[PDB]
Curated annotation (Swiss-Prot), chain A:
This is Large ribosomal subunit protein uL30m. It is found in: Mitochondrion. One of its GO terms (biological process) is mitochondrial translation. The chain holds residues 35 to 151 of 161 of the full protein. GO terms for cellular component: mitochondrial inner membrane; mitochondrial large ribosomal subunit; mitochondrion.
UniProtKB/Swiss-Prot annotation, chain D:
The lineage of its organism: Eukaryota, Metazoa, Chordata, Craniata, Vertebrata. This is Large ribosomal subunit protein mL52. It comes from Homo sapiens (Human). It is found in: Mitochondrion. GO terms for biological process: mitochondrial translation; translation. The chain holds residues 24 to 108 of 123 of the full protein. Keywords: Mitochondrion, Ribonucleoprotein, Ribosomal protein, Transit peptide. It comes from the Eukaryota.
Curated annotation (Swiss-Prot), chain E:
The chain holds residues 35 to 142 of 142 of the full protein. It is found in: Mitochondrion. The lineage of its organism: Eukaryota, Metazoa, Chordata, Craniata, Vertebrata. GO terms for cellular component: mitochondrial inner membrane; mitochondrial large ribosomal subunit; mitochondrial small ribosomal subunit; mitochondrion; plasma membrane. GO terms for molecular function: RNA binding; structural constituent of ribosome. Belongs to the mitochondrion-specific ribosomal protein mL42 family. This is Large ribosomal subunit protein mL42. Keywords: Mitochondrion, Ribonucleoprotein, Ribosomal protein, Transit peptide. It comes from Homo sapiens. Component of the mitochondrial large ribosomal subunit (mt-LSU). Mature mammalian 55S mitochondrial ribosomes consist of a small (28S) and a large (39S) subunit. The 28S small subunit contains a 12S ribosomal RNA (12S mt-rRNA) and 30 different proteins. The 39S large subunit contains a 16S rRNA (16S mt-rRNA), a copy of mitochondrial valine transfer RNA (mt-tRNA(Val)), which plays an integral structural role, and 52 different proteins. GO terms for biological process: mitochondrial translation; translation.
From Swiss-Prot, chain F:
GO terms for cellular component: mitochondrial inner membrane; mitochondrial large ribosomal subunit; mitochondrial ribosome; mitochondrion. This is Large ribosomal subunit protein mL63. It comes from Homo sapiens (Human). Belongs to the mitochondrion-specific ribosomal protein mL63 family. InterPro entries: Ribosomal_mL63.
Length: 117, 156, 148, 85, 82, 91
RNA sequence: GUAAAUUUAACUGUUAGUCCAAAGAGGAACAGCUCUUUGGACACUAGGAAAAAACCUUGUAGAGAGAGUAAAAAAUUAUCCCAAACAUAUA
């Protein structure tokens, strides 16, 4: 019968080749995830729908940020085939209160404060 | 590294080669100087500006009218300027931005002539056998702009 | 529906932005009933708002009739003869203000469809396209396969 | 074409973020600017909420790391006053 | 006169960038058509449809008239563009 | 061909175009990148435990206050006595 | 991560269907045949597969004479055939 899926954990042991392929950094691992939905919730089972309603991902191609805790990873590990997750790299530290209403996000995965229109 | 001439050893496309970069830059400097003196003297005539005002792109020239599908929060007959000009051209030369052009090289004016609401348009949804028959009337608001002038300036 | 109704092209009255702008509305004609429920929303508009509307653009002559009828209405006469009748029975303050401002902020042309969003009166600067732009010429004008 | 725009670090959709949509679309004749577009206000609000959420998550999980460190150190220190005489 | 593309079929256009790189300027003059490329001036209701069909090269169908219903729906005073 | 042409023993097998395969590969590479970025979490499970308890508790308390707060709205004398001016006059 | 769940007062309505993937039973390891189960869709919108409720892509709804994308192109040597064509110009 159709069921849920249990992914063996060996699928998540990233290799050094993977590290040098993507923007690898095993130690000092990244803090947050920026997640975007790229597929429909319809034609997909009901628990996937509920998860995609739990992680704030209602509209597609609207990015939403989340922690990198293993709980949220255990949620993403069953809607992974409907989401593109990129690290939220911060080349300069997270914004301060005065310069927070003047920040913006670049498609490379970086949050930046110097956004004068 | 040799191949006898054959119909498919070579690439059918005719392999062009680009000009030398330094001579290319000198040529570019010469032609921009030419267009600059043309603009400074007054050679040009009427001008057309491709503009990006407020939803989408309009090709605009002096004296003409443009209908925008929304209100603009402006009293009637209240002069305005349209930034975001991405092409401006005359008989002999035309300047394209990458994407836009500075607010000093191109000046596009405008005025608001009338504010209306569009004709009553109908939204009707219907489905067969389900007694699903919805009707609605929509009247979008619109404002018409007279483009007044397009002044280009020598700053290149 | 579009086919079943008239249309027009985008237009002004007298090229009404080149030299200047002239308010198109010449006249407003309010009719109100002193003692009648239907004119209630109009009555206060003659007390509160009409004075400031009259001063806020002075080129419009505003008449108010104050008959002993039961129905109101507003006639908006424009420069080019068009008359826009509007009904204000059983209305209120804010909607009558919005209506009179809408009348005094549009031209008199009929509200029927607009076919082009533009009216570029000189739609070329560089020479309109005919099939011979971008087509070469040949020696002495020989159409192909000729000899002499 | 928008795959090229992404491999050059731009919004894939020119009506996204860039010069075309961020900058104001008009200005009064004399020069004094005009109240911004409601799209600008909406997107400023959405980006503000995004930044505030990033601050919240980052600093709360850091606070959690700190609390775990001091909890382990408390375990270590109150493991040391059971070893006298 | 630069010809990566043979800019001679129609005319020649010159491309350049302003010094910084944030504007592109193209110079296109109206090339004039030469003299010596020029030439000098040189100084009955079925057959009706068939002859009009051969002279204007359209087929016969459009030339017959249309009934009253298809000629009161035609618009006498259509709007004038421009 | 017997009937309901898209099924049966003599069904017509659809062909796999090149662009469909390219789309499959695009989605699959995106999946590989997801596998990577889920392959290194910050806090081991024992560390995250209870770190955001306060925020959840206050959010749920806000929910509870919203739920408990429902009650009929007020009723003013001004409304009932301002309906009484649908008979204004001039005189 | 979420903002919903349980309980109280109150009536109506449906109460089971069809097809697709999957594990099975009966039947010919036929049937657009009958019967259980986990999931999906349909009886709701839209685009694709030729036509196409059931396959693939997509949901919250209006105006636009703006933009980026999703799925998405057939390859080997018993009235009347049935898309016209095309081995190579930078994917």
């Amino acid at each position: 019968k159709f069921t849920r899926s249990r992914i063996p954990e060996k699928v998540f042991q990233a290799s050094p080749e993977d590290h040098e392929k993507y923007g690898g950094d095993p130690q000092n691992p990244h803090k947050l995830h920026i997640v975007t939905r790229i597929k429909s919730t319809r034609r997909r089972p009901y628990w996937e729908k509920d998860i995609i309603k739990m992680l704030g991902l209602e509209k597609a191609h609207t990015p939403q940020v989340h922690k990198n805790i293993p709980s949220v990873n255990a949620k993403l590990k069953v809607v992974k085939h409907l989401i593109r997750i990129k690290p939220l790299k911060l080349p300069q530290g997270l914004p301060a209160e005065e310069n927070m209403s003047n920040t913006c996000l670049k498609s490379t995965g970086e949050l930046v404060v110097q956004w004068h229109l | 590294g040799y191949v006898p001439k054959t119909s498919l050893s070579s690439p059918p496309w005719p392999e062009v080669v680009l000009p030398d970069p330094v001579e290319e830059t000198r040529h570019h400097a010469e032609v921009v100087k030419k267009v600059n003196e043309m603009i400074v003297t007054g050679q040009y005539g009427r001008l057309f500006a491709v503009v990006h005002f407020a939803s989408r792109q309009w090709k605009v020239t002096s004296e003409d009218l443009i209908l925008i599908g929304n209100e603009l929060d402006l009293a009637c007959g209240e002069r305005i300027r349209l930034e975001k000009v991405l092409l401006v051209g005359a008989d002999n030369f035309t300047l394209l931005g990458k994407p836009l052009l500075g607010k000093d090289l191109v000046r596009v004016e405008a005025t608001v002539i009338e504010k209306t609401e569009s004709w009553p348009r109908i939204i009707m949804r219907f489905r067969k056998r389900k007694n699903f028959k919805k009707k609605r009337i929509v009247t979008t608001p619109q404002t018409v702009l007279r483009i007044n002038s397009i002044e280009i300036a020598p700053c290149l | 529906t579009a086919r079943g109704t008239p249309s027009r092209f985008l237009a002004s009255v007298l090229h009404n932005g080149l030299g200047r702008y002239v308010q198109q509305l010449q006249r407003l004609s309010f009719s109100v009933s002193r003692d009648g429920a239907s004119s209630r929303g109009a009555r206060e508009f003659v007390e509160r708002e009409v004075i400031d509307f009259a001063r806020r653009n002075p080129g419009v002559v505003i008449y108010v009739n104050s008959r002993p009828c039961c129905v109101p209405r507003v006639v908006a006469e424009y420069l080019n003869g068009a008359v826009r009748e509007e009904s204000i029975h059983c209305k209120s303050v804010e909607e009558i203000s919005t209506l009179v401002q809408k009348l005094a902020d549009q031209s008199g042309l009929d509200v029927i469809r607009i076919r082009k969003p533009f009216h570029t009166d000189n739609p070329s600067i560089q020479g309109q396209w005919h099939p011979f732009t971008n087509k070469p010429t040949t020696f002495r004008g020989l159409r192909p396969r000729e000899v002499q | 074409g928008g795959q090229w725009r992404l491999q050059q670090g731009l919004a894939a959709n020119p009506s996204g973020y860039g010069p075309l949509t961020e900058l104001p679309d008009w200005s009064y004749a004399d020069g004094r600017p005009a109240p911004p577009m409601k799209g600008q206000l909406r997107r400023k609000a959405e980006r503000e909420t995004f930044a505030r959420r990033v601050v919240l998550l980052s600093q709360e999980m850091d606070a959690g790391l700190q609390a775990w460190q001091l909890r382990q150190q408390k375990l270590q220190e109150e493991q040391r006053k059971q070893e006298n005489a | 006169t630069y010809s990566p593309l043979p800019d001679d079929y129609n005319c020649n256009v010159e491309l350049a960038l302003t010094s910084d790189g944030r504007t592109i300027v193209c110079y296109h003059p109206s090339v004039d058509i030469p003299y010596e490329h020029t030439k000098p001036i040189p100084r009955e209701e079925g057959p009706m449809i068939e002859q009009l069909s051969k002279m204007f090269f359209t087929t016969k169908h459009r030339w017959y008239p249309h009934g009253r219903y298809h000629r009161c729906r035609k618009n006498l005073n259509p709007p004038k563009d421009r | 061909i017997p009937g309901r042409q898209w099924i049966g023993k003599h069904r017509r097998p659809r062909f796999v175009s090149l662009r469909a395969k390219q789309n499959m590969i695009r989605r699959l590479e995106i999946e590989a990148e997801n596998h990577y970025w889920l392959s290194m979490p910050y806090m081991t499970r024992e560390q995250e435990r209870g770190h955001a308890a306060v925020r959840r508790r206050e959010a749920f308390e806000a929910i509870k206050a919203a739920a408990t707060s429902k009650f009929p709205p007020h009723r003013f004398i001004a409304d009932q006595l301002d309906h009484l001016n649908v008979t204004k006059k001039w005189s």
